[PDB]
Structure 1
């Protein structure tokens, strides 16, 4: 298992524009287009990203390309951030994926605000970190996914994804 498979499982794949659980326009594999209510606005962002006139519809290859870029970006976000990098660096391969999963979903900045969990992860206090992570809007708004990620951090295995 690896980061791509992981997130592909967590985000699903949709080739047509859609409103996510928060009402934001998205597409592909968890690619947020815009927080704006205008579908035209989302259509324009999509066309700009793809480089063609899409009509709100994309191909699988295209969706995978957006995903690769998005995965690349999450990683760079982690490496650039003074708070994330040291944690990332301290972790093992499986857990790094869990970290990437979160940065992908909520951005460098959202993850960097989980101060206490970050610190516990850095100390390898798995059970405490998992309890701390669960106290969040993140968890309450994405119960199933959040449990899979927290479980990964807790265990250091891909068991949650089998």
Structure 2
């Protein structure tokens, strides 16, 4: 299983624009179009992204291209972040994907805020770090997923996912 598989499972695959949980415009595999409401606002952005007039519908292939870019980009946000980079480096491979998953869902900034979390993590703490996480808005708005992610982190295994 890998990062790509991981998130594909968590974000699903939609070929036509749609509203997320927070009610945002999205398409593909978790690709956020606009923190706005103008459905046109959103087609424009889709247009800019693919580079074609899409009328709000794209291809699998295209959804996958957004995706790669999206996963890559998270990977670098982490490596550029001063607080995240090193956490990332200290972890094994599964746990890292988990990290990458988080960031994808909430941005380097969002993530790098777990100031506390931050090192328990690095301390090779979990458990305690985990409970902290269950006490967050994040967890409370998408528990299923949050759990699968927290589980993966704690355990350094893909159990939650199969």
TM tier, shorter chain? over 0.9
Q: Distance in 2 between matches of 1:148 and 1:116?
A: 21
C-alpha distance in structure 1 between counterparts of 2:118 and 2:60, whole Å? 35
- Partners of 1:133 and 1:84 in 2: how far apart? 16
Per-residue CA deviations over 1:44-66 (Å, capped at 9, x if unaligned) read 00000000000000000000000
Structure 1: 5+ residue runs without aligned partners?
none
TM-score (structure 2 length as normaliser): 0.99
Q: Report the CA distance between 1:126 and its aligned residue.
A: 1.3
1:36 aligns with 2:26: no
Give the CA RMSD over aligned residues.
0.4
Secondary structure of 1:109's counterpart equals helix
Residue-by-residue CA offset, 1:76-123 (whole Å, 9 max, x unaligned): 000010000010000000000000000001001000001111111100
Tell me the number of residue pairs that the alignment of Structure 1 and Structure 2 aligns: 162
Cα offsets for 1:30-75 (capped at 9, x unmatched)? 0000011100000000000000000000000000000000000001
What corresponds to 1:125 in structure 2? 125
Q: Does 1:53 align with 2:59?
A: no
Match of 1:154 in 2: 154
Deviation string for 1:3-43 (max 9, x for gaps)? 00000000000000001111100000000000111000000
**Which whole-Å CA distance do the structure 1 matches of 2:13 and 2:57 have between them?**
12
The DSSP-based 3-state class of the residue aligned with 2:127 is helix
Name segments (4+ residues, structure 1) moved above 2 Å: none
What is the alpha-carbon distance in structure 2 between the residues aligned to residue 70 and residue 158 of structure 1? 22
User: Which structure 2 residue ranges, 5 or more long, are not aligned?
Assistant: none
